[PDB]
Symmetry: D2
Subunit: 78 residues, 4 copies
């Protein structure tokens, strides 16, 4: 039956495209998600390291204020 | 006194704090610039890639459109 | 207490250079770990993506070959 | 149909699979390359950041050193 041979062909072409669409949309997906999961760990790197940098500076800023209030007194006695 | 020594200490201290602020803020920058370049070039990938899959699927889709038309007409005739 | 704050001071100093390498080496560490984690996940993508593309091409190639096998037969009948 | 519509379809089907092969290998290319940019820009970061950090520690040590050559002298006078 040619109405069947050809129907067989339509269906198989449709299934071949459907498979291709879902393999493409999966690369789409696999790619959008690697980005999300990279972007996240990355802007988390940043508001972690930026934190521990601001802290290094707070400490240093305290050791350096300690040091000046010591000088400030010994200059009043000088 | 050596109020000359004390004052010279106050100012070596301030310069050493200042230098340390600059180095630290500068490290802040390198870090933000990394994350910015990385975000930009990941968003270029994502856009380029999706656009190339869009292509691949629409070419694929049009090869099918044609294939099915040879079938549509050959069923008129069958 | 002649020399007691000429020491109580060096023990605030000793204790704060130390804090500062503990902060500085820990900052370089966060950068390192974040670089590893980001590569570890680019590579995961690259593999999972290269492989899903390979599978899309393989299925396409099999379809195409099924197409020519059909053509080649109707050429024996032609 | 004819040997001639049959050869033309062989042909269009090769031009379709060829195209698909380009577009796909080229999505691969687009993925690999972004991954190399992100690697490069991480290296440049991990360079300049481990650099600037090393410097900041060697200035805060150059100056812990000065701060103790002074203490050592004032202890000889005490």
């Amino acid at each position: 039956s040619n109405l069947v041979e050809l129907e067989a062909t339509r269906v198989a072409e449709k299934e071949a495209l459907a498979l291709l669409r879902e393999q493409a949309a999966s690369v789409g997906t696999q790619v959008e998600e690697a980005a999300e999961r990279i972007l996240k760990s990355l802007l988390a790197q940043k508001q972690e390291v930026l934190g521990q940098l601001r802290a290094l500076v707070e400490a240093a800023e305290e050791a350096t204020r300690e040091r000046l209030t010591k000088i400030e007194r010994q200059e009043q006695v000088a």
